[PDB]
């Protein structure tokens, strides 16, 4: 193995750039040549591939987004795109690929591996929705973005004795909602993985109101329903002074946190090392607070488990 | 004059607390006793009035919201509420009132003044929509809140070559939209005070796309239409890769900026000084970069003028 | 057990308030009465003890510092202070105490336990210098504070092709320095736990300069030497364009991060639960990414192990 | 006039990039060709001059520092460097120059103008120390950087009933200190332009202590003395629980605020317009809240006047 490729795929996340940096620099420290692949698997098929020198990854560690760009490509799942991407890989002498993205992009890493181009999946997504990892790159930053936004909501809610219903991101995963909900002392948190009871939430808010609390907050994972939809259901059970906000795509951006930058650096390094020892078809992540890797095949049979105990904890904390 | 009251009215804004602090401390430095009035004119009528000692305004300068609370009161405009509030004022020996709020609350300051309780209006609102002032307390902070959020939107937009349509607050005023739009290099800014042309905006975005720009941004004042509504109109004129976000009530909260804290302190001090020299029925603000005051009556005949030249400037800057 | 006390001891840290909140609310949810103890063990001896109602811990989760205050007390280690504190405990009917602080305060938790007042140590310190825990409350926030500050240093360094030597906090622990160093792409990191070589660092900086890098950064744990002292040594080995900054006590403050707020909430809850099951003399923390507890006695025989592999990682990343 | 040059000179400041952007885009909108000049007057003499296309100023508005770099050049004041820079200007067909920097760099703009290359000075410095302007680009951001840092200091000070002495930047100007001091409720502010009295400050702190205040803060402009030096003098007049911090070069960096980005955009545009109407030897800035320009010669006879009334205001606010 002499040359490696890097691509970012799926929805961008803060810290992707730190991962590209880490892969590039650890690879160059081990005698490898590095190539950037733009627009994910889309540019792979198009042949948007270029040499990445060590100097080319300067001033990136603190930068959000992906400087390589990301773009969706359905035909890469099919043999048409596979072969076209592979021909492009061969054209540039690339032997192996690091794929930075969500578990969706891991499919492409596996297909590449099966065609003789060993590949590693690296978790870059805000959602933390990948099996066998407790963290994905971008997740901590999204949580901070949402927390800071909801802190501001709590300021205005408190001045006015208002209840807010707030959508956070997550896709079909409730991890952002639970973590941000606890961090922002939400009265209730509503997620796809665990049952919720609108009437019970209404009762919580009523009791809090009676106890003199000057604000209310329900954090609703976007995967359940919109804030507007939840607010409408809530209003059936009581007369509340309530507003609904949807935080939106700000959760995908911003300079990556200390945790995201370090996580991206650890995982990028691990990916290169796995490749150096002749491994492929692996996804790297965090288990039991340490860096681990698994066959991508094994992830496709499993589901992400979030920290659902946070709901029980917040049940005590919300008064 | 021996005793003064303070109330916050209308939608809260970052820096209201710094204003209460400034009024309280400058009044106490001049031998006056100070009383807090909770829930704006609502608590005035209810008699929610208490002594504010100098120690009671510690640890407030950096705190968002209003610790006195704000709450709407229609009946205070009428003679029913006026007399009830006045009786409450007399009950606590209060001679004068500082009213911190939007130009809507200035009505109450004037009515109070007409009844022998000299009052000063102090501009506390994020919207910057008050005649004869170039700044209101909360405006700079809202602009920062919106800028930081839209910076994050620009990060994710750029990774994906996406156009974003983004609503910012302002009520019926375009000041936030223009200032934030320029600060975030929006392709176009859409405000209530000046005509806009969806087809022309579409042409801007098309040209930018052709020139290789990797993101688009239209900042739409909430006073024009929703981001969803603008996006729908835009899609008529071209096929864009576009999303729509509404920033929401986060713009009302957050720790006040250096400018908001200093502005609140200057204006609070000015209010007390005006009262000391036996003035009433005045609103304080900023003109030609300095602190000024005007008869509240004069504001009711005028309209806020924003810096519309920013649209012409941004016309050159957006490529 | 019917009544519990809470105190914060040692240097304050962001998230202490979230811990008091979590202890108070989880205790009240389990039928316990809660009492605040001000000024750590100092106020314990003075008898500065008061009832903490559930409403009294509202609007605290996002607040830095400790609202109970912290203050040093040498005589509490001695039997004089112990007995005096115990008499005060008995005076208020308190059966058990949660001690939020550094491993130094754990001594007091143990002494209390030995006198029939079961106590739990909870790690509140920015330094992450406690045995058997991978995280202390305040650590993530300090890391963010330092990262954000050093990002700004990197901006100005880059405009001017300057090298910066920067002290971060940590006491005698290098954890902040390593984590922040990696997050800010330092050319070198200098810590008390592992050898460093000024000449080698000078060589790194020289090579980087030759390669066209427009900034330099050495992160020096305060536990090694001052930035001024390091800069002086560095200047012996080369002629550098260099400045030295000491970040200072800002690292101790600021609103706690999402991780610190959740960590404080988990650990506060765990402390209450341990007490409910009749345990005492335990310190709670994080091992293998999960909440654990250990006999305080066992910590006194051990040393904190930091993630020193970060130095090897950063060796590759720094070019 | 067909071609214009842009350079940044002196200490960098957040918003310089927004100014380069604004100059470049407004110039291109008016049919001019634009050239970047690197390393200030140093690269001008070296001939580090290149074409700046409109696309080349994308993704700069939010970026700190100067992407063109800044670097000191003594010989440009002399006729040796002047002629060499001029020959370089002629080599690239450049007719006029926008100089972004401190009033020190304005000397170079004037010399250029005298040699037939009309030039405009644009205020880029954090210090706000330029005659005939109430604001310089970078000033608001530095104030925010210092405010946010000192807020954190106030958190830790309050937990411990500590007094902090804190140096902020400013060079020989007290503007940052006064503005930040008021914004952070300093007990006292110490600046070069107005007398201070250490004994009186000590008395303030003593009285505050007696009144139950849980923190102290003295903001000392770096132009007076170091925080260490002030603390030493203070300790003569009383026994205080005191620490000293120097904020340092973080004040020079960070993403520019909404005000700095808009200010840079207005002033950059104004510079281009002045050049278009055949003007030269002018410095642009803010007076009476509006954009103005003056002969550079006139600035050399005047001194910056800061808002010293803030000291009298803070005298009332500090209790």
Swiss-Prot record, chains A, B, C, D:
Q: How does activity depend on pH?
A: Optimum pH is 8.2.
Q: Which reaction does it catalyse?
A: beta-D-fructose 6-phosphate + ATP = beta-D-fructose 1,6-bisphosphate + ADP + H(+)
Where is ATP annotated to bind? 11, 72-73, 102-105
What is any one of the record's Gene Ontology cellular component terms? 6-phosphofructokinase complex
Q: Which SUPFAM superfamilies match?
A: Phosphofructokinase
Control of this protein's activity: Allosterically activated by ADP and other diphosphonucleosides, and allosterically inhibited by phosphoenolpyruvate. The binding affinities for these effectors are decreased however, and therefore the allosteric effect becomes apparent only at high effector concentrations.
Enzyme Commission (EC) number = 2.7.1.11
The UniProt entry, under Pfam families, shows:
PFK
* Named cofactor requirement(s): Mg(2+)
- Tell whether Ubl conjugation is among the UniProt keywords: no
Binding sites annotated in the UniProt record for substrate: 125-127, 162, 169-171, 222, 243, 249-252
Q: Which PANTHER family match?
A: ATP-DEPENDENT 6-PHOSPHOFRUCTOKINASE, PHOSPHOFRUCTOKINASE
Q: How does it assemble?
A: Homotetramer.
UniProt name for this protein: ATP-dependent 6-phosphofructokinase
């Amino acid at each position: 193995m002499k040359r490696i490729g890097i691509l970012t795929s799926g929805g961008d996340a803060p810290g992707m750039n730190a991962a590209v940096r880490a892969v590039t620099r650890v690879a160059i420290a081990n005698g490898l040549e590095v190539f950037g692949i733009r627009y994910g698997f889309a540019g792979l098929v198009a042949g948007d591939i270029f040499p990445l020198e060590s100097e080319d990854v300067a001033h990136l560690i603190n930068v959000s987004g992906t400087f390589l760009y990301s773009a969706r490509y359905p035909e890469f799942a099919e043999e048409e795109g596979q072969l076209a991407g592979i021909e492009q890989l061969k054209k540039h002498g690339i032997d192996a690929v690091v794929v930075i993205g969500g578990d969706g992009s891991y499919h492409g890493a596996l297909q590449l591996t099966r065609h003789g181009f060993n590949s590693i999946g690296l978790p870059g997504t805000i959602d933390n929705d990948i099996p066998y990892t407790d963290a994905t790159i971008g997740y901590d930053t999204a949580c901070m973005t949402a927390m800071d936004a909801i802190d501001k909501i709590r300021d205005t809610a408190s001045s006015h004795h208002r209840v807010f219903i707030v959508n956070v991101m997550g896709r079909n995963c409730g991890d952002i909602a639970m973590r941000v909900g606890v961090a922002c002392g939400a009265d209730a948190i509503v997620i796809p993985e665990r049952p919720y009871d609108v009437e019970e939430i209404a009762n919580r808010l009523k009791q809090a109101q009676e106890s003199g609390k000057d604000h209310g907050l329900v954090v609703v994972a976007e995967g359940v329903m919109t804030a507007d939809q939840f607010m409408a259901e809530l209003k059936k059970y009581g007369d509340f002074d309530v507003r609904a906000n949807v935080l939106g795509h700000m959760q995908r951006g911003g300079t990556p946190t200390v945790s995201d930058r370090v996580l991206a650096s650890k995982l990028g390094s691990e990916a290169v090392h796995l490749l150096l020892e002749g491994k492929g078809g692996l996804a790297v992540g965090i288990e039991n607070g340490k860096v681990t890797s698994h066959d991508i095949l094994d992830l496709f049979d499993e589901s992400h488990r979030g920290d659902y105990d946070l709901l029980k904890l917040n049940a005590d904390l919300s008064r």
